[PDB]
């Protein structure tokens, strides 16, 4: 699943790889579930899709907190922008 | 690029879609750049790859803050876990 | 995501399409998470991946019950084979 | 497999073989079902519907195997399958 | 699902498209099921995979017979080569 | 091209893999060539595409005969259904 | 299958598209068949794969001749390099 | 890039593979460039796309001549059909 | 990942590979971000996406400069065409 | 080939899209050609592959100049970094 051979990757790089792809997959799931909630024509199914969608957000947040704790620049950039006021850019 | 016809998706759902796939691509970029930093055998290139990696992290954080401000569940779950000290589970 | 024009598909066919891919999505997550749990060298991360892994199993089970309730043959085949003993073939 | 088999347990690799099989049957059910709706030939429609329902059978068989070889599969399947009332309230 | 717009495709062409991809997908399943039978280290799973494998062959055979009945060249070439003896390339 | 490591696949299994994917590729070619025959607005091109289409059918039939001769249940199931009359679901 | 919408593509451009991808698919088939001919351990199959391989070359040549006849730059460049002697880069 | 392990493929088979996929790439570029020439609304870009397109045709022809010189059946079939007059089904 | 085995590649060829794909991915992001800038209906998001778009151009430009310094024909062709007045098809 | 419907994209954005993908595919060809040049064991093919490789570099440079002329931030960032000396990070 990695793009360079494992033999040349540090342990810490492969562990961050596992978390990042996990966040990606959860993000993708949130997006698709959200679209199916809008498009679904069965309310029972919609309730399931909406419930699962929100748990995927939880999974992404958990794995993202791990990344923050194990990468100096994730912690720096997240602290800069998350739970801030005014223009997100400046 | 969406999985459902745009005609059945709310406008707010499609804007969150644009943010989500933006974070995904930045995350993918961080991961690939990080691997090339480890595998690179040219110091000049490694410096570029490491610099760009760190800005991709910035892009993800910026877009993720937007999601936090425009989706209550993102805001709830991000508030629970982010900047916590202690077991994540 | 449908392979046929939506104009010709019954609603229940498209809703089952949404449910089936949801199960597929979750099953893929279960498998990948499980492999990362084995391969991970950080216990903290492993705890997260194992927790998420088991909730994906929950998502699949929820969506599969919906399929059981909205498809006569899903219900027949799930009734035949699930929660049984002995050879799974011919049972 | 997304990790090298050298670090995966044999039980993990067997569940991988089962999970992928359920996925492929689920995908076949979905595609067959759509072609049944779209087919304009009576004899083809009958074949596709016959195969569709056997793909459900394949998935159910392999899904039972997972139930017997993974405690959490057994737990979550037991919670939700063959129930009445809201699926999101259980 | 098709390469050209459905507007310009004849009806029979789209039906044969549905049959062909069904044969393709069944063949793909036979191959993957067969490889997992060799690699599986669990006898109960191996029995399931082998059972499903052979049913996929039946699905492929059914849909291929439909193709034979609805396409003159499928019927001709399948008549030339199937159930024959001696070098296949010969006939 | 195989899903499992060659270390664990029987020789015969890999040869059937080579035949199966060959039939798949020819079938895909038949399908796409046929769609291009319908859509083409150049008769010279249509004549080539139709000629190639029918030879891809020949390739598939040839490779399928080999599978029939080297796999018992290919032979059984093909014998049941091919060159028959009445409903195929039988 | 078209990178751009058909509404803006001239019909001649889409016809050349159909020929180009046909040649591409045949080239891919030649390559794969040739690799399977080398790796196969069953002579009967090898003979079939080798036969099919060479007919795929014929399909590519046929469709390529059509391109030569319907594109002036295909004709120019195919005339420069095909059936020549000496370094290809210097012809 | 190869569908079989390099250990069982002859040297010359792998070289023809490198030539074939190169022609495939060139053909793909020719097609896409041509489509962008039709859809482009900027004359400067269209001039570039058309110039690059025609050089991709040159690349394909060069590599194709190499195949002709290193594969007897390529030489046979190209000799049969190229630079001819009359129906291409000949 | 690479197409040829890493055992037949020079160390420089693989480093240029690492540079090229970085440019490709940066270019892809510029294109996608720019399309989202046009389609977005939320000004906040539009400002973020437009900001990220322009930083991707820097990533592409930086990595492209590295290629110029590490490949003779990149230096030649980039010297010929970039920062020039007149038609690009004649420089 | 665009990710948003062409109805919501400005005309100039789609023209830059056509240029960008052209540069991307040209870069992709350069990379693959370069790897085949290293791995090829036939000198005559290597000479062809190396020649085509360098013309792909030319195509990318041409299309890249057009982008520089039709996008203010491409012109800014390319001016900053191309044809410089010292560390590219600063
Ligand atoms: Ca997924
Ligand atoms: Ca036009």
Residue numbers in the entry:
A (entry chain I), F (entry chain E), H (entry chain C), J (entry chain B): 7 to 96
B (entry chain J): 7 to 95
C (entry chain G), E (entry chain F), G (entry chain D), I (entry chain A): 7 to 97
D (entry chain H): 8 to 97
Sentences from the paper on this structure:
Through site-directed mutagenesis we show that the conserved glutamic acid and histidine residues in the FOC influence protein assembly and activity. Analysis of each of the single mutations (E32A, E62A and H65A) made in the FOC highlights the importance of the iron-coordinating residues in the catalytic activity of EncFtn.
Our study reports on a new class of ferritin-like proteins (EncFtn), which are associated with bacterial encapsulin nanocompartments (Enc). By studying the EncFtn from R. rubrum we demonstrate that iron binding results in assembly of EncFtn decamers, which display a unique annular architecture. Biochemical assays show that EncFtn is active as a ferroxidase enzyme. While EncFtn does not store iron itself, its association with the encapsulin nanocage suggests that mineralization occurs within the cavity of the encapsulin shell (McHugh et al., 2014).
